[PDB]
Design a protein around this ligand. Structure first.
Ligand SMILES: CCNS(=O)(=O)c1ccccc1Nc1ncnc(Nc2ccc(N3CCN(C)CC3)c(OCCN3CCOCC3)c2)n1
Length: 288
């Protein structure tokens, strides 16, 4: 790892704390970082720190490296988790990101279902969706394809800002090998545009498909996509025209928007720009 001046953070100025989560990928812990906020070199900030586990593979390391590199290349946006820094020298790779106090969106929505712990309003659901469409519209404009959009990969801040996170599978638009049989082999099937597998390509419009599944997760308050259907049967069902059903208490219009995202023809799906404008309208006219 060639030393990156702008991004390197002093190992001695970081204090690791309570664990946040553990996957096949690695582990994330809470931590205090003194001075990561220049110009407040006095002040210690709660952060999240992503790193490898003891059983990590070569691929694990290079995936953590790529996730970090990707986060450096996309600018600041309100609806994307910010990279804060990295310890890359003389020790294990630590990737320091901004801390979100309310966890991932799936858990967040589940914990605040109706009792049959601040219940979600319809407006709140529309607002979440709108925020996420704005984040994706930004990402698309930066030539980034995320490829792993899901409620579990969204973070919720203290003030309920939605933060697209987990850039572990994300790529520059030009950094996918079209038509090779191994391309898109590691994308979660239930969130994946059909063309990602059938055609072995990935465009912003493939992210749109994923966005649709995310919307469905939002409106079911964190439900599981295609319930009762196994992943090995899904594509056969999708070619035949199966689509998930309307969530209770979701409007007809928001459901048509989901369905549009699940158009078999990529170019017939809305753009993120169109999703933003539509959701902006629905949110505002709800308010009034
Ligand atoms: C999608 C991202 N993907 S990731 O970056 O790979 C990644 C993968 C896994 C975990 C974290 C990340 N990332 C990341 N980055 C910045 N911030 C955060 N915050 C955060 C995350 C989880 C929780 N959980 C999960 C366990 N649940 C039971 C609820 C709490 C959480 O709760 C915070 C409140 N707790 C209360 C108890 O004491 C500690 C503080 C806050 N996570």
């Amino acid at each position: 790892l060639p030393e990156d001046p702008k991004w390197e953070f002093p190992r001695d100025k970081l204090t690791l704390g309570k664990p946040l989560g553990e996957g096949c990928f690695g582990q994330v812990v809470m931590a205090e970082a003194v001075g990561i906020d220049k110009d407040k070199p006095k002040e210690a900030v709660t952060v999240a720190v992503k790193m490898l586990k003891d059983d990590a593979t070569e691929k694990d390391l290079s995936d953590l490296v790529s996730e970090m590199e990707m986060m450096k290349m996309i600018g600041k946006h309100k609806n994307i988790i910010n990279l804060l820094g990295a310890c890359t020298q003389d020790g294990p790779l630590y990737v320091i990101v901004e801390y979100a106090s309310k966890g991932n969106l799936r858990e967040y929505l589940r914990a605040r279902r109706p009792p049959g712990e601040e219940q979600m309003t319809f407006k709140d659901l529309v607002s979440c969706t709108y925020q996420l469409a704005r984040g994706m519209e930004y990402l698309a404009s930066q030539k980034c394809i995320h490829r792993d959009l899901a409620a579990r990969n969204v973070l919720v801040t203290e003030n309920n800002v939605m933060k697209i996170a987990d850039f572990g599978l994300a790529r520059d638009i030009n950094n996918i090998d079209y038509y090779k049989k191994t391309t898109n082999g590691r994308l979660p099937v239930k969130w994946m545009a059909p063309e990602a597998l059938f055609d072995r390509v990935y465009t912003h419009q493939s992210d749109v498909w994923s966005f649709g599944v995310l919307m469905w997760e939002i409106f079911t308050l964190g439900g599981s996509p295609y319930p009762g259907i196994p992943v090995e049967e899904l594509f056969k069902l999708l070619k035949e025209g199966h689509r998930m059903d309307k969530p209770a208490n979701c409007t007809n219009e928001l459901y048509m928007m989901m369905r549009d995202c699940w158009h078999a023809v990529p170019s017939q799906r809305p753009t993120f720009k169109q999703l933003v404008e539509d959701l902006d309208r629905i949110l505002t006219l709800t308010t009034n």
